[model samples]
Target: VDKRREINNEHPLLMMPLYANGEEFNQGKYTFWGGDTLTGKWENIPDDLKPYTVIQLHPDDLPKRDGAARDFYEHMLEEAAKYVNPKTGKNEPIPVILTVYTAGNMPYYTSAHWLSTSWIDKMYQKYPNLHGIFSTANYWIWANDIENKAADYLKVSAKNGGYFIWAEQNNGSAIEKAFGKNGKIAFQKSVDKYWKNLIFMFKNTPAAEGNDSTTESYMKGLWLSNHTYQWGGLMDTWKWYETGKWKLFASGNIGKSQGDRQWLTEPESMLGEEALGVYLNGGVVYNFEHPAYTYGVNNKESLLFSEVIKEFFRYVIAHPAPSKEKVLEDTKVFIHGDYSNKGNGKFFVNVNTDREQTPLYMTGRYNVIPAIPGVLKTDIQIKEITSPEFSSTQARKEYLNKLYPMNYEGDIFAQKLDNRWFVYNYKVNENVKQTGKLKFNSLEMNVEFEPHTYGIFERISNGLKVNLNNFRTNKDSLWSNAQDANQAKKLPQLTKKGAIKWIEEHYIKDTQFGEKRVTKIVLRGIDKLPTIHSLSGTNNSYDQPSLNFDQKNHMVTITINSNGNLEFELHF
Candidate 1:
């Protein structure tokens, strides 16, 4: 917290578990301080874990009576006060997110009912750091009063500088309850309706109308769900970008899992592809599965998965997604092989859904200059197996011995070229650059897929002019190198006229208020030497890149690279 505070002047929100025991409320049972009765008590939560730490209260620990709940809440506040700032010697209160689990057999509604009463308003006055409540309910069908009260609690929570999260567990349960039968369509509709109502309820309240209310800032919440295929399928047509609302989807494990162990069941690495998709689409990912489990963070499976997610998080923190409008309007997708391009012409992602090697084609001018392509290899095989269902423990050990050597390999293949496009046996390496080229009129590339494996192509410029005649409808001849000679038929066809503008849309440091500034701008396909007459948002005599003019070809180029918000106008 101190380190982050020194850099960004604020701390990043850290979610921690604060399990609630079935017994009476007491400081002895508080998990953060080393209480062992609960299922998820940390022995010693470091002082650095404070600031924006969100202490998640387990549902089982919720008190039956309002008075008991208030006492438990006060105990949490007292503990939070213990984490004092060394510089100021003042109490640094951490945020609290009351997690409520609503299974049919549980006393979910009873605790929820007590928490939703007027007591919550009082608790907010007593403990200003109370963030809000999150209901982990699998299904939405419930009594009218319970629903109404839950919505009311959200309004109150929002008014007091917190928010409520409506969550669904697993995948098909909620959709089945809402739509009678569950599938992609029904699942999409259920989520859409839930979010639509959530947005409406928050915005349509009196608290939201006031300037002092934290409703706008606290409007966002988590959209928790499990399974990669279903979540990815839902995202295919979800239109989440258009909603103008931000919500984090807590996607569960990418591989097959039972309890603490995630098995190597799937051939392809869905985790790698899903991580790219989530970050590219401006979504937050809280990958389920504890880092401290038996087959946990130390193993190859978890380490590789963690690295992929870490790299993406780092990239987005620097170069965030463009405006929601640009993301919705300019973002194009060709489902032929799951080819998607972020509107700014900076990033393109391609995934092969086929079981065999497939070819991909796109209609746009690709400025194949200096941009590097990256591929993440994901493959795993299980060698050993253990089971509790065996007749004897020795029998289980004997069965495990039969499958002793498991193998796992994640490989991506590509070839390098000088300027024009060609393919060879390119060995896959993380963040390694592979050379290739595609011509004007139609862009074509041959991609190989390992059953259901996927790859990402990063930093490729799509600023060239679109050629109608160069378009090819021949999917059969798509991956063939025979079509390469036709690429250079029409060379310097820069698509958009005049100076091309590129800006880093939304810049954030530690997920807080950061300036949005344009970093780079380039001019392409200009006749004669174009001169910069005036540039705004920078010093008049600012040091600029040396202008390069192709005198023989009658093409002029000027590139401006600045850390400041700079815009320039050119004259021929």
Candidate 2:
């Protein structure tokens, strides 16, 4: 608690569990927390514990109160509100509202597995700060049944506010907790269920697996419509190990003391990070503090793999948020940010999921962008930088402005030529190595999977400048490795009372149409001067050949584009 006090300005908001044993049968029985009631004593909650805005009430572990879950939940919410108003929310600096925990499967809303939608709406109505649910833990069991539960989660949250769920590869991996099973044998059996559940999840989940729009209707959760998995060292259960506190292991480490070593191999690392391309437009925010430090940190390949993604995230965030207007089986088109651009100048995104090296004239080609009337109309201006493949040549104003005839193949992210009209494309294959080929007006454009894993798509912008202080995304990278030199060397810079080593600035040249942008990354708080040269991402075009050093100015600059991501680097 005292340690967290220093970083009180902005820290990871905790999601604490709210529980009480079944014996607390006041007006109702307690089936959630087995320990003690953390109610009515909000005034006594330590300063550090206040950040736990989202008090989780997991009924899975609760043995007693089977039907009285909602009443107890309301009771906690009412008390929690007096402490941190559910409507107003708790704010240290990062204003956070309160929310509950719920799953996305088990349509029946029975027992501990499923949740009731009506309760959510009712609760949210009463406590507006009730920030929806975080659907996870239990991977859906019934085929096609997952839809009903998800329907409530997706729509209800949309109507009230927003509750995002980054679909995991294995949701119901905690089978042991369900049956009150312990021991390695029991947990491994849980993993057995997890593996089996993954197949059912893939089959029932409405991702773009087919060649047509049959699955579009099922893809309701903006992310659920075109789903992808969030897997890495993040597989399996951490608590099952029982002694994960050992926190030291090596690659290929699995059980017991070495369980903390959750690192992946080189090829697996590449395949895994690259597979994230399927989720580029969807967006992901992750942290690796424990993983980066736990395994002795000297794995160059793993570190390099991580850097490429840091670069990728730097790229996507620069673009305004993407709103999905049209959803198809193989293709989904999104208008960037607020859809403010006009004909030929809109920041449109065309995602090709099933396309793989297919010809433009043949399979899965988009004829017209389904511009949703007033909601999404493309009037992209030529001078605009964040524009996309819009068709102004056609006569109809609606069709003219929308991006035209887009054919695709392979799992890739394809965009119009950036400055210099350079075709910006990346190869995103699943498990196997495949080619991502793009086309512009029947002209086949060639782009290979960047040898530098991140070089596949080149970032193009109208103008460029890097800002060190964009807090929209976590600046954890700046500090995640700052203390440890071994891991710190993997990133660009470090910190120890000098400054914070966080992403600051670097400029990106819109190689084609003068769409230059800046991804500011700053090397903050260098504890000491070290021979810093260049940074590489698994030997690819994204590698910084050399730092642009200015001795007199006491600063350095490096401009790079990795997988459509552009970032400006600077040092002092």
Candidate 3:
């Protein structure tokens, strides 16, 4: 479990293709001799590549030579063996995802000449480093043999190790082409079936035990929707990750000229926001480039964007929040706000969806402790880059031409040499003793958010008193329910049903270094005994609670104390 925790603490792995030149793209910076080559050679391995956990080999249009492909497969194993774990200083190979396309422009199902189940089985027998096979269907409809072969590949992949990923296809384009009249319905059915199969595999397959198993030995998939920037798709993908069974993969752009092109240079493009969104939503974003469009290799703009992404990942891993709430299955943390018609169009906060409209987006384990009662506001401005109705190459070109250079105007904590991206510097301000109805603990400094960004703020704990509004039990799956029960039992129980688990997890931070912060947490309409249990974090020490049983009000009041940032469960 500690190993799992360590893996979870790190940022999600960023996966990118290895160029035919045998160079690996480390986020955006390319390094020679770290990737697989047609010829088996493993002489040069860089330390920079150690940070990444996933390596991809794209043989998109390689000729199906009799023994050359097999030779290349052997070389991939040798390349993987060269990877050294930074922590253990041992040869711990990372997961390698092999992508094969039938032709340069045709759908993956057109021909399996580039890759087949026979070769996958042979490769699995030869190298335990082979993690999974990735392919895509150009059209929704395919021959019976094609469908059968794909299923067989997935089955074999699961049996040996790793999983299969159905890569990106143009949104509705393939569906419409396959089922001209009832395309949407047919597509929906196909998607439903795909998810069902995926879930079944995860449920049945027991995870492999050991350090390398988490990165490999499990079936996972990603979705790359073409030309789509709506919140619905993002939310849907997030749901899969929340299941704790699937991994998140974001293909920010596909280097396509027409369909679903989210170019890097377009200022109005939400690609930046989407990239951040993936990180915030506990996912990794991949910089995608077709073998033909290798602009990122030399383009300064592309490199700058890549650097920004790489920095974002580094920041998240380096500065994690103090606590995290246990997200119940099927529960989405992102609240959709109303779209504003003013100020380049904005998404207004819907109070009903998220009462704490302030601090809209935050990661890490803790909330930002505030020094005053001032309201925290995050103003976002998103300009339109492209229209859904337009799919022409000329329209994209015009949009790109008119787009302005993105500016990072905010307090600087860290900045790149190019001056394109910078992280805001945050510092605590003058401390306050006590104030307001809910006496909030005072801390120093205020942090500002950049445009199109969101974060969490400290809630004032000033003498506020209220009945517990309401609580609902999670019921997504039997495992989740069982897990809750196991956690609840950890607290002191008073009733037959055990302690009432009001909040699965709560995080608090004391403003002062040595001073303790004490606050009263009142739960109205509750009839069970209350207790607390530390889930994870420092400063688990707490003062004795002063319980107030107000039978007339039908409420239970409990006082608690802590020294610094801590996460725990409050059970009734």
Candidate 4:
């Protein structure tokens, strides 16, 4: 009760503020307190824990607006919130926000607008309790008219009783001047003065106007520093970290490559007397470079992509608020792999690195979460899989061969179903299988099997008859098998009844898409349900096809698409 009273009595303006750096925030850059690892240094807890910790939520990946991406946001927040202080078991999730920028000076949101909206909405809808910090790219924010509506958007955001805004200046001086002040580069004594000014303005004024009410003291103004990539860039200031001179303090650091010499140093030792240690590197910035931001392959430098993100979360975990301990009894680590670039692999931890080799538990992912207290480790669960060919192997390869022409080896094939073009790896084998069924309720699209490697396929909306032999038609079969394979040019037309029978004859192969491989499946768009019907004229009745919508025991399940369209899922 006394603590509450004391807290309330203090100036509401004087709240715990978090500092962030755009370049090296989530680059897995860390500064060791005593040594490279946590040991003797953790024993000495700092006196003032006001600025408890700095959570650097890097939206570098910029995930698309999909269930898988949405899950990333949810999992990250939930994981971080779980770590409660053992003594109080009270978890005050750390404050985190997303920063946008690139080393070559490209803005991420411009090219990936759809992805940007997807990620931003995920945070707003999924984790309302958490706050968001949007560090507008130095160039793009204004280029895209972000400044015109900056106050208005922030006003609306603030009115909603959520979100805090921070104007991060990259090439610090250029941005400060644009906003009416001369930006300061790292190491200048006046830089601290600019920091104080920013904190005061955002904190005192109405961050957003709603009912003319300013944000409660719970909201804080943050002054971010960019220039330095890592601890090496931070100019030393003995009085700050040691004497507790500033309300909120931070620095930058970087690891050029795997096993870089600086990675072995204690973060505190690298802190140039200034309480800032963040890692920044042009090479590391481009590893997962997204095309949306105009950052494409061969255009940007490469760094340890996954490892650096791990370092970002580790830094937060090691340094907790009120106690800059190496390991918190209760700590939460949130990683956000926004999919800045489109990649096929799931954003999970690489289980290959040794302790010295890799420090992060998870890589290639993104999530927004509340602060968790304790050593929280994160790994990804593959939510869905997709491929060009059959979604799964084990389909009747012999039937496939009979249905289509032979000499499929090295032949590229494309399929058009419902206007969606699918490319698959081409190969010839009697046992080869292809599965492309959507797992309706499973929330996963399972596509794995032999693929048709080639160009695009146009959509075949209207029903078409099946030709058992020489199935080639309007489709352009690129890189096909030898023409002199003794196969006739014309294909034999199969009766509609014969076509269904031929398909049914290969039912076993069809089942290979799932059958033993998938335990739960949902076929969306199939309005039919499980029922018994007489076949043709036989007295015997059998179970009609049903779309599996089981809430449990099914790995894949289908659901209605955004347009209320049907989709299926087959999962194991």
**C-alpha TM-score for every candidate:** 0.40, 0.36, 0.38, 0.26
lDDT of 1 by residue, 483-516 (tens): 3323322223212110010001111011111122
Cα deviation at 286, candidate 2, in Å, is 9.8
User: Which pairs clash (backbone N, Cα, C closer than 3 Å) in model 1?
Assistant: 20-61, 383-406, 421-437, 464-495, 465-495
At residue 254, give the lDDT of candidate 3: 19
RMSD of every prediction: 22.3, 17.7, 22.2, 27.5
- The residue-by-residue lDDT of candidate 4 on 118-231, one tens digit each, is 355446555543444343334323343333333333433333333333322222222333332222222122222222111111111110111000111001101112111111
Scored by TM-score, the top model is: 1
lDDT of 1: 0.29
> What is the alpha-carbon lDDT for the whole of candidate 4?
0.23
- Of the two candidates 1 and 3, the one with more favorable lDDT, higher being better, is 3
**For residues 341-414, could you state the per-residue lDDT of candidate 2 as single tens digits?**
23111112233223412111111233222221121113222112133333332232233235445444444334
Residue 178 lDDT in model 4?
Answer: 30
Residue-pair clashes per candidate, as listed?
5, 52, 22, 81
Evaluate candidate 4 by giving its C-alpha RMSD to the native, one decimal.
27.5
lDDT value, residue 318 of candidate 3 = 56
